[PDB]
Amino acid sequence: LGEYGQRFMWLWNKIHDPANGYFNQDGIPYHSVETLICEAPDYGHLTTSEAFSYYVWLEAVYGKLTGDWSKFKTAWDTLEKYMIPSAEDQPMRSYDPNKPATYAGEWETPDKYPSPLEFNVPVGKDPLHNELVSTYGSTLMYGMHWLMDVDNWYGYGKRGDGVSRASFINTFQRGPEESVWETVPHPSWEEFKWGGPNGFLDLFIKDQNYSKQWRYTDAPDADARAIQATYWAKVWAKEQGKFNEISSYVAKAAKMGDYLRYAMFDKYFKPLGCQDKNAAGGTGYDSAHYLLSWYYAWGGALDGAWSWKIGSSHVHFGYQNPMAAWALANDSDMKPKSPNGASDWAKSLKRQIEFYRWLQSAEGAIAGGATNSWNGRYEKYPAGTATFYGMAYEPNPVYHDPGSNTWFGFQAWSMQRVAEYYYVTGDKDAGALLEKWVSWVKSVVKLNSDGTFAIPSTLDWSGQPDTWNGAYTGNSNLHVKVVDYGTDLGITASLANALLYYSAGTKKYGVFDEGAKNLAKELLDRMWKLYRDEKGLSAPEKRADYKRFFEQEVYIPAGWIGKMPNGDVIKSGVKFIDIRSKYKQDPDWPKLEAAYKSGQAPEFRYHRFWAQCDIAIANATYEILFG
Numbered sequence: 001l002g003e004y005g006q007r008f009m010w011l012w013n014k015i016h017d018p019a020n021g022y023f024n025q026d027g028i029p030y031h032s033v034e035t036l037i038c039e040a041p042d043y044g045h046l047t048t049s050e051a052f053s054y055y056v057w058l059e060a061v062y063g064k065l066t067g068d069w070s071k072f073k074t075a076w077d078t079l080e081k082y083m084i085p086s087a088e089d090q091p092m093r094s095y096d097p098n099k100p101a102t103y104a105g106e107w108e109t110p111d112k113y114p115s116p117l118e119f120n121v122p123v124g125k126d127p128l129h130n131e132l133v134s135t136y137g138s139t140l141m142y143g144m145h146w147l148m149d150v151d152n153w154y155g156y157g158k159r160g161d162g163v164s165r166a167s168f169i170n171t172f173q174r175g176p177e178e179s180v181w182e183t184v185p186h187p188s189w190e191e192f193k194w195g196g197p198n199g200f201l202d203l204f205i206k207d208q209n210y211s212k213q214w215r216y217t218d219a220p221d222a223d224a225r226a227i228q229a230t231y232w233a234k235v236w237a238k239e240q241g242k243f244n245e246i247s248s249y250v251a252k253a254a255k256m257g258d259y260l261r262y263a264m265f266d267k268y269f270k271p272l273g274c275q276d277k278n279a280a281g282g283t284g285y286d287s288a289h290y291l292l293s294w295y296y297a298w299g300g301a302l303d304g305a306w307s308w309k310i311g312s313s314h315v316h317f318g319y320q321n322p323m324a325a326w327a328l329a330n331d332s333d334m335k336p337k338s339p340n341g342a343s344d345w346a347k348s349l350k351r352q353i354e355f356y357r358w359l360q361s362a363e364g365a366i367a368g369g370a371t372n373s374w375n376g377r378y379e380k381y382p383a384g385t386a387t388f389y390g391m392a393y394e395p396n397p398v399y400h401d402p403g404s405n406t407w408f409g410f411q412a413w414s415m416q417r418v419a420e421y422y423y424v425t426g427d428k429d430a431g432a433l434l435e436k437w438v439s440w441v442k443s444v445v446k447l448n449s450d451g452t453f454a455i456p457s458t459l460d461w462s463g464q465p466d467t468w469n470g471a472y473t474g475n476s477n478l479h480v481k482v483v484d485y486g487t488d489l490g491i492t493a494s495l496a497n498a499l500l501y502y503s504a505g506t507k508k509y510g511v512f513d514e515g516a517k518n519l520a521k522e523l524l525d526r527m528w529k530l531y532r533d534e535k536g537l538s539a540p541e542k543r544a545d546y547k548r549f550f551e552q553e554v555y556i557p558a559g560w561i562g563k564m565p566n567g568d569v570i571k572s573g574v575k576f577i578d579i580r581s582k583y584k585q586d587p588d589w590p591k592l593e594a595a596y597k598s599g600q601a602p603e604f605r606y607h608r609f610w611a612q613c614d615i616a617i618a619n620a621t622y623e624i625l626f627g
């Protein structure tokens with residue numbers, strides 16, 4: 001009704017206008033309307049569980065502002081139908097909780113893969129499996145696979161059929177230095193139809209022999225975002241007296257939350273702090289870090305001879321979600337059906353808040369995270385390494401070039417969730433954590449005199465936090481630096497969103513931080529004034545990194561020869577473009593070619609689905625909180 005709720009409706013209409021091309025023919029959202037883009041997905045009409053989580057979120061807010069919950073319902077409907085592997089996709093049998101997987105090391109460079117399986121390395125026990133099967137009556141893992149080839153652009157199809165849309169694929173498998181430019185896109189369902197003699201398996205894992213198999217990878221941050229969104233849909237619908245419409249969808253989030261607990265465990269269920277790959281495996285919750293790790297994953301042979309499940313030893317603050325955790329732990333509508341689900345989430349909420357505090361720099365920005373597997377090989381931490389419940393501090397968990405915490409974006413995404421949690425609960429630790437972070441945000445955001453703005457784009461880090469012992473020390477030797485600035489609109493909106501929930505919280509619990517409200521309102525106003533276009537909002541960005549289309553060598557072992565579904569030959573020396581020759585059909589290909597041949601950085605105005613969502617949600621958030 002107000003200026004800001006109307007802003008949401010306008011952009012919402014742009015997003016849902018079928019001619020704008022945010023969705024495919026099945027109503028699956030793409031990563032972006034534009035196809036020529038490479039950053040985490042390597043093609044614009046792939047999609048992520050991230051995009052799906054933002055879709056649920058957008059429609060939850062639509063439900064608040066309209067009272068119409070059909071959009072939220074179909075969002076979840078599409079999510080379950082396509083993004084969660086069906087019973088046919090994950091026919092899991094012969095799982096052994098006492099031996100959940102077999103160990104393989106992680107290695108610093110892609111040329112060190114395939115990683116050899118090490119059959120003598122002890123793995124711990126999985127204490128979730130039996131409870132979950134007993135609770136749900138099924139072996140189906142209720143979590144989103146992270147990456148989808150929406151319109152079968154790569155050509156793997158569904159379950160190796162080579163035709164079907166909504167195709168499950170994966171890329172990242174070769175360690176901390178395998179950038180988006182250096183992957184080999186491969187099917188989640190492996191039947192040896194493509195790639196080499198053993199499909200794509202022996203690029204990644206070295207074994208004595210290879211079996212046809214399926215495997216999926218969950219991105220815990222996305223599943224938690226979907227739960228977070230559903231929490232708000234739950235309270236908003238309850239307020240309108242419409243809880244019952246969306247009741248079985250609140251249950252979807254509860255079940256997803258029940259399975260998301262796999263993200264809380266060490267990769268191979270090794271005890272926290274073990275620092276020895278040959279050490280005995282954990283006997284249960286001694287291998288739980290209780291944080292939202294980089295992934296969980298699960299696989300199984302096509303015949304059903306065996307199956308496996310892994311968590312992840314690596315944790316990034318950018319993944320955490322105290323709002324989702326609180327909801328699953330405490331809200332009786334949201335509590336998982338398993339005996340221990342809610343209790344585990346209560347543990348996670350506490351551990352997550354401690355993690356944020358432990359990582360808070362001298363300035364206020366949040367440092368990267370921690371690992372329970374040094375170098376991904378359970379090695380001994382160097383002397384003087386700062387630790388958190390036996391886990392070693394890492395400035396850049398999981399990825400090193402470029403570092404996973406050199407991206408400012410995680411600051412906004414993750415602290416938005418803390419801000420929501422604080423707004424809801426008044427948690428003193430969350431409040432103190434936010435106050436210092438907001439103080440830092442105020443000192444780094446540029447509100448220019450001419451009406452423009454700039455937010456941090458790249459960050460750099462030095463030092464370490466103090467080792468964690470339950471109390472924040474100030475971490476005087478942990479430092480952030482802003483390396484450069486940009487106008488990332490999705491992140492700008494997320495930052496505004498975070499500042500708004502914090503501001504509303506301080507009004508509710510302490511001294512109203514008007515400045516935080518005003519910084520957020522300005523960001524949203526200036527953005528609205530400057531960046532509206534035909535399909536939503538976009539700001540120009542140069543992508544000098546796109547020379548890697550042409551220049552980036554993809555590592556392939558000597559003598560290993562395979563083929564992509566379109567016929568592209570995979571061998572030593574191939575470039576990014578050589579295994580993706582269909583990119584040459586892209587409407588923007590001449591533009592990229594012209595820029596590259598001329599030694600110029602190509603420029604784009606992107607409409608990323610999540611970015612448009614963050615913008616719509618942030619504006620509506622002002623209306624909901626300060627309207």
Ligand SMILES: OC[C@H]1O[C@@H](O[C@H]2[C@H](O)[C@@H](O)[C@H](O)O[C@@H]2CO)[C@H](O)[C@@H](O)[C@@H]1O
Pocket residue numbers: 039040041048050407409488490608
């Ligand atoms: O990997 C996190 C996040 O990145 C998003 O792309 C970033 C990109 O990593 C950064 O280098 C560039 O400057 O800006 C964009 C911000 O949108 C990507 O859109 C997400 O899917 C991904 O989860």
